[PDB]
Structure 1
Amino acid sequence: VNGTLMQYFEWYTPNDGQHWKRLQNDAEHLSDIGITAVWIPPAYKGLSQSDNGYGPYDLYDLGEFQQKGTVRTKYGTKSELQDAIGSLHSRNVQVYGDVVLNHKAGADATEDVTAVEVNPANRNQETSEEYQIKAWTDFRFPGRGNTYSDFKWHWYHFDGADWDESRKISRIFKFRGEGKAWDWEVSSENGNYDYLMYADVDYDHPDVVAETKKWGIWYANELSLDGFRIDAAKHIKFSFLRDWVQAVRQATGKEMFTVAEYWQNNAGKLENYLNKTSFNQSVFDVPLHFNLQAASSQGGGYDMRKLLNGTVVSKHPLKSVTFVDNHDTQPGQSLESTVQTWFKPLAYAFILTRESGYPQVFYGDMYGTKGDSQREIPALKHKIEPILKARKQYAYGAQHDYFDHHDIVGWTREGDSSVANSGLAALITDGPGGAKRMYVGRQNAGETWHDITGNRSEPVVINSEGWGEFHVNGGSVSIYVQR
């Protein structure tokens, strides 16, 4: 059966501490609709209870130690998360944990550090003489003590930070120590993009490297994780991420599927990351997201024949996780670039019914986003579920592509003899509707097919040769399958 990932959170998921309970409760629904793996938000204690997890304070605190004035994380307690995972597993759904290793946030105290400022546009350039700062680098874990790990962090485990408590100024500070330098290889944007936010981990420090691998193995074993989602990969030494994934696989003996968030609309840079990590991990198909977003925003003017241009799925399908939107691209967020609602079902058809790539459904698209703009994403589950059913029950067999018109494009799947009544014919259009003759396999001759989305009520009969004349409404999607 085809695999389908679900990102199970959005930016505005509530800080009610009930998200793991929500997931546990949704396990049956997710398995029923065909989700086979869930990517959960960072599960460890952030700089505050309300942090989404991307400002992690203590990786070893999964919502079980009193730190930051709370036991639970934003999402709930450790036991609640373990219950959610147990429910998913009972329904043959896997769980991928989010791994936030770039930086640490929320230090317990400052320390005196010799530092230099660097150019924000070229971090390889020092722009001040050395001076003393007070940086937030002492991480002591007062509520955990030595439980699980007696490692304590200090300035020297980091390459830099962006705040000096002495002068109360925000700059990119690079620390001075013994052979300190920004890590390589990382994205070359801004000269060296090792530094992003908070206190940047130094992946040159041998103790840090060993400790982080130890943590990775611990985290997998503690939650019985089936794989990982790596946050902010372009800001972390690539050979380190390569080795870290391998270390966890060696210890567990498990596949440990991993997808990295390498946030760059550049297929060539994404391919470089794949090479530098020995093709041991997938990447999100950032270019495809941007293409889909472009099509959704040009009011019909986008050349739909070009949807696959420059995408990772077109070049390294087996290493691509395709997606429509995420918590960073949703309205009001840092990488805001939302696929417009009218086009969203078309985009889901594109990632869920095509043969290549590992598609990811976004919780915010299914259930809606709860931000404060007058342009939040509505709950589109009623439009995505039919497309998920198309994936689960019909998207099998040989695929034929029809990227042959500036608005109306489509593809078919012939079905597989081992999946009863499988096969489909999909059409999408960014402009006025119309028709397209497409081949669905001579073995489907004479069959009555119908649009599983309900957008069109008229059935299509496959002729004696395996060709059907399919129809799509304007700015819409139709996916035809056996009646």
Structure 2
Amino acid sequence: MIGYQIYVRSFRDGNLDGVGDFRGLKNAVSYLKELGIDFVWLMPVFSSISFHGYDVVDFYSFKAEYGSEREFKEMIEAFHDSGIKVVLDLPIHHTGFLHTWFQKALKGDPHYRDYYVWANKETDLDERREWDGEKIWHPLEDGRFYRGLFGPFSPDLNYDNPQVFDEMKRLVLHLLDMGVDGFRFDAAKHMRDTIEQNVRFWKYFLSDLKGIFLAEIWAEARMVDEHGRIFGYMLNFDTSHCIKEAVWKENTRVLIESIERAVIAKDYLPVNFTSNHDMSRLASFEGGFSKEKIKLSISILFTLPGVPLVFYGDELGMKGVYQKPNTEVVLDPFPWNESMCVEGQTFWKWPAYNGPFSGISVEYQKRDPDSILSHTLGWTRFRKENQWIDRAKLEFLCKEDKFLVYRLYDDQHSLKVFHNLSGEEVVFEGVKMKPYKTEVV
């Protein structure tokens, strides 16, 4: 299984407005199929007034700029025709400020009032998030306070209430019923107030369902495992980050620890990624880094157990240094040709880091065998031809500062992988480990 995360507005336009949509996506299947993609993770495709859409105003309708429900269902059908699955990003931890549910709660509707979380006489009005450390309780003029982790505009949904659970499970069956193959549950860790209640919530929620369920759950261990049994796929921020740091620090230490910590003997498939929308792009890691280092990052990613995932554009080495609040700097328009002018090209804004004639268009890289695209296509074809690696066991054979060597195997296979994070050959078991290269035997 190989995954590909897409920001729909910046990928492929299918109606000629320069704005990515459902029809364009439909037409990029040849490309996805060539890059060896099994499934696609689609960032929020529902009604939301933000360019990213993580604050949904109605899960029962899609972002008009992307197309109609009828156009959406036709796209699902075309992907399945070519053997690709569609996984939607489902932000049900909270809603948007403008969702009809929250609006009725504000106007006092008792039914909906309990759909959200309000401050009690014994509520710590000063409680803050982990990261941001910014507040989580928000005031209304009439003296009330509602809880909103991700901000005062993204009010928290109350899962202690059976009504809400029901409302949302009805939505998942509906989309499943529609052909959707699975979901990326955004903020899966904060569904309940305590972690023990959280594991049970997900147990009941996903209980009778089948599909690809992805989640971000940071408890670093033992809970990640508790959750992982239930989801089956867990976003690996640990190793995803570590692969890049080691390559950058040219030192196996972190990568080795991370593998033994987050990759080995799991009762679920960990999902390792080049990068995502909440951070800088693989090519812009630590002040960005060289073509040969980007490449090596991908080599390691595709020679490790679990499911490899590429953020759209990373296969081209697209640039992007994460920044707030204008987080669209990492969501630049995906370039099909150098002039960035061809049927299907998107240009909804001027690019932040990847402008035209930069030698990074798909068209352009397809031709230079030395390109990151040409390289990625190599490892992705390899991986496609070796599905067993997803759940293969890892055996270390060489843990040196400058280089690493391990063995993948299961009952009917075994492959030896060689990673050289430094610049100058070195021989292992008769094999020549070139500078900044990966070798399999």
By the TM > 0.5 criterion, same fold?
Answer: yes
Normalized per residue, which structure has more helix?
2
What is aligned with 1:57? 57
Contact 2:191 2:201 in 1 (8 A): no
Cα deviation for residue 242 of structure 1 reads 5.5
What is aligned with 1:293? 244
Unaligned ranges ≥5, structure 1: 64-70, 110-135, 141-150, 160-174, 439-468
Question: Which amino acid counterpart does residue 184 of structure 2 have in structure 1?
Answer: R
Cα deviation for residue 196 of structure 1 reads 2.5
What is aligned with 2:324? none
What is aligned with 1:85? 76
Cα deviation for residue 322 of structure 1 reads 1.5
SS of 2:214 mapped into structure 1: strand
Aligned in 2, Cα 1:247/1:219: closer, same or farther, shift over 3 Å? same
Aligned in 2, Cα 1:191/1:313: closer, same or farther, shift over 3 Å? farther
Q: Among the aligned pairs, what percent are the same residue?
A: 17
Normalized per residue, which structure has more strand?
1
User: Distance between the aligned counterparts of 2:216 and 2:4, measured in 1?
Assistant: 15
Question: Which amino acid counterpart does residue 431 of structure 2 have in structure 1?
Answer: F
User: Distance between the aligned counterparts of 1:398 and 1:246, measured in 2?
Assistant: 31
Contact 1:304 1:409 in 2 (8 A): no
Superposition map of 1:402-441 within 5 A: 402-412=397-407, 425-438=416-429
Cα deviation for residue 294 of structure 1 reads 1.6
SS of 1:202 mapped into structure 2: coil
What is aligned with 1:478? 438
What is aligned with 1:226? 181
What is aligned with 2:172? 216
SS of 2:32 mapped into structure 1: helix
What is aligned with 1:6? 4
What is aligned with 1:393? 385
Question: Which amino acid counterpart does residue 470 of structure 1 have in structure 2?
Answer: V
Equivalent of 1:372, from 352, 374, 377?
Answer: 352
Contact 1:267 1:310 in 2 (8 A): no
> C-alpha offsets along residues 4-42 of structure 1, whole Å, 9 cap, x if unaligned?
122123896599442323321122332343322211112
User: Distance between the aligned counterparts of 1:103 and 1:7, measured in 2?
Assistant: 22
User: Distance between the aligned counterparts of 1:176 and 1:221, measured in 2?
Assistant: 37
User: Distance between the aligned counterparts of 1:347 and 1:85, measured in 2?
Assistant: 31
Aligned in 2, Cα 1:349/1:245: closer, same or farther, shift over 3 Å? farther
SS of 2:384 mapped into structure 1: helix
Cα deviation for residue 98 of structure 1 reads 1.2
Contact 1:99 1:231 in 2 (8 A): yes
Contact 2:87 2:182 in 1 (8 A): yes
SS of 2:309 mapped into structure 1: strand
Cα deviation for residue 423 of structure 1 reads 7.0
Equivalent of 1:282, from 233, 238, 253?
Answer: 233
Equivalent of 1:34, from 36, 41, 56?
Answer: 36
Contact 1:288 1:308 in 2 (8 A): yes
Unaligned ranges ≥5, structure 2: 137-147, 320-331, 333-350, 363-371
Contact 2:252 2:399 in 1 (8 A): no
Asked if residue 352 in structure 1 is aligned to residue 302 in structure 2, the reply is: yes
Cα deviation for residue 349 of structure 1 reads 2.2
Contact 2:247 2:296 in 1 (8 A): no
Equivalent of 1:176, from 106, 112, 119?
Answer: 119
User: Distance between the aligned counterparts of 1:101 and 1:57, measured in 2?
Assistant: 11
What is aligned with 2:162? 206
Question: Which amino acid counterpart does residue 92 of structure 1 have in structure 2?
Answer: G
User: Distance between the aligned counterparts of 1:342 and 1:276, measured in 2?
Assistant: 37
> C-alpha offsets along residues 367-401 of structure 1, whole Å, 9 cap, x if unaligned?
43526248999673222110111112257587654
Asked if residue 195 in structure 1 is aligned to residue 146 in structure 2, the reply is: no
Contact 2:189 2:198 in 1 (8 A): no
What is aligned with 1:258? 213
> C-alpha offsets along residues 202-236 of structure 1, whole Å, 9 cap, x if unaligned?
212222121111112112213x1111111112222
Between the two proteins, the alignment pairs up a number of residues equal to: 367
User: Distance between the aligned counterparts of 2:9 and 2:124, measured in 1?
Assistant: 33
Contact 1:408 1:433 in 2 (8 A): no
> C-alpha offsets along residues 298-345 of structure 1, whole Å, 9 cap, x if unaligned?
2x255366253564212526331121211112259xx98788454332
Cα deviation for residue 293 of structure 1 reads 2.6
Contact 2:402 2:420 in 1 (8 A): yes
Equivalent of 2:86, from 91, 95, 98?
Answer: 95
Contact 2:214 2:235 in 1 (8 A): yes
Q: With CA pairs under 8 Å and 6+ residues apart, which has the higher RCO, 1 or 2?
A: 2
SS of 2:406 mapped into structure 1: strand
User: Distance between the aligned counterparts of 1:399 and 1:248, measured in 2?
Assistant: 30
Aligned in 2, Cα 1:478/1:92: closer, same or farther, shift over 3 Å? same
Pair member with larger Rg:
1
Superposition map of 1:143-162 within 5 A: 154-159=112-117
Contact 1:286 1:311 in 2 (8 A): no
What is aligned with 2:367? none
